[PDB]
């Protein structure tokens, strides 16, 4: 279980610090929450990321999936996700699914195929869909869905072994926490957690969330 | 979810006092590990739980599934199972279940009707059997097998989905230890922890538990 931390780019230096001493194994850097997005910047924090021994998740939210507008992020995914061990796009952003694909795998790098839905846990056949298409269009499949119950959070782990292999899986918010934790047995490779004492609904602190994998988590 | 903890007669009043103040809700008599199977013995320790303001699951386990013989065995039962919130009978010692049903059913008790398997975790079609049986007896169906892997723990959880209902869900070991805080959401009403350190592989104690309970379900 990798444990990835998402960071803006305030106070980078110092967070990073923490994330590398606390256990993160990963940074995602959310550059759609960034102050600047200019090609440099973004190379710099990832440039920052790795000298500290870390692997880097490189992701420009679009405004549908609850990020915001940046108006370069074509030119900041083509041109950095050779330069990131994983790169975060939507499946919804069909445009740059193939090139992304096409320009990650020449450099090495892996690709992260994303969904979100922040106000329920969709039907099992949507489950199943994006899990698929996340696999055809070559990267590791991400569902990061709201649970409006505990019931939902056993639905999305369980449906998801129908589509077997590697992926990332999120029931959203206080009822899916555990998610975070036990995804892990079901085939989830990345957890996310906060920097410091987590405090969105849902969340679980980096600290807490790396005591728990070597408790429940045999080496 | 309840938490449960199995305790044998050694140090018993002052190991009721722990599992007391630790937040435990249940006290499990591990009879088959007691070493006064007496009647009063035991009706006396029934009574002791109950003082404290904690419930109790009656449990003498068979030879077959990790217990010892117990001679007064049936007498223990059908004397004490009105006297216990809980009772916990082997599915395989079938000429019990009946009688024990009607007993603790006049008495408005509650029969939690086992199987264990120390080797390995069954193919899931006996996971549904087990289920389904538990259920036409009356009873809350108990399920504790050993993980040989991740993929065990969450076949167990997902496939006993399919057997809608309360229940008991357990993967023995350290792949399975993620089990006895996830079963949760999968229906698994009770979990069981160690008094204090984990004196068994997947074992986890009683105050680590109430912790997790309350990070994990608020809700």
């Not at 990073?16 to 850097?29: S, T």
């Not at 975060?88 to 839905?117: F, M, P």
Request: net charge neutral.
């Amino acid at each position: 279980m990798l444990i990835a931390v998402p960071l803006d780019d305030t106070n980078f230096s110092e967070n990073l610090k923490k994330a590398k001493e606390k256990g993160a194994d990963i940074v995602e850097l959310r550059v759609d929450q960034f102050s600047d997005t200019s090609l440099n910047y973004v190379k710099e924090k990832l440039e920052e990321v790795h000298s500290q021994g870390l692997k880097t998740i490189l992701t420009i939210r679009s405004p549908e999936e609850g990020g915001r507008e940046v108006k370069n992020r074509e030119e900041l995914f083509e041109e950095l996700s050779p330069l990131s061990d994983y790169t975060d796009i939507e499946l919804s952003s069909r445009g740059l699914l193939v090139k992304l694909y096409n320009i990650t795998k020449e450099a090495g790098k892996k690709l992260i195929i994303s969904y979100h839905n922040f106000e329920l846990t969709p039907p099992n056949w949507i489950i199943r869909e994006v899990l698929r298409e996340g696999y055809r269009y070559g990267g590791i499949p991400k569902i990061a869905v709201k649970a409006n119950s505990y019931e939902d959070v056993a639905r999305l782990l369980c449906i998801s072994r129908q589509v077997e292999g590697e992926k990332i899986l999120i029931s959203m918010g206080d009822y899916g926490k555990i998610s975070r934790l036990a995804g892990y047995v079901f085939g989830s490779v990345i957890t996310y957690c906060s920097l410091e004492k987590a405090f969105a609904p849902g969340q679980i602190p980096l600290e807490e969330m790396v005591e728990l994998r070597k408790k429940f988590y045999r080496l």
